[PDB]
């Protein structure tokens, strides 16, 4: 005995994976290659551990 009218609007939005790209993957690979540089340090030095 009581019916109401609905008009739905589905707004569909997609994110732009650019601002979150650099801010995420770049520092990770940076510290990664810095660690790779860190392997070149001889175990005898001792500064490798602190590295």
């Amino acid at each position: 005995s009581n019916s109401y009218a609905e008009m739905k609007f589905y707004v569909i939005i997609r994110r732009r994976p650019l601002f979150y790209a650099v801010s995420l993957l770049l520092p990770s690979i940076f510290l990664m290659v810095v660690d790779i540089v860190g392997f070149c340090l001889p175990p005898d030095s001792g500064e490798r551990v602190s590295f």
């Binding site: 070149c40 340090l41 001889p42 005898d44 030095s45 500064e47």
Partner: peptide, 30 residues
């Protein structure tokens, strides 16, 4: 720092001894 260290191994190769301690030394001195 990998180059200069006491690891009780090896000897300086003459081929790269002349290239660095002789030639590059004169090149750097000037």
């Amino acid at each position: 720092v990998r180059l200069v260290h006491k690891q009780d191994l090896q000897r300086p190769v003459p081929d790269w001894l002349r290239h660095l301690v002789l030639d590059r030394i004169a090149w750097i001195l000037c």
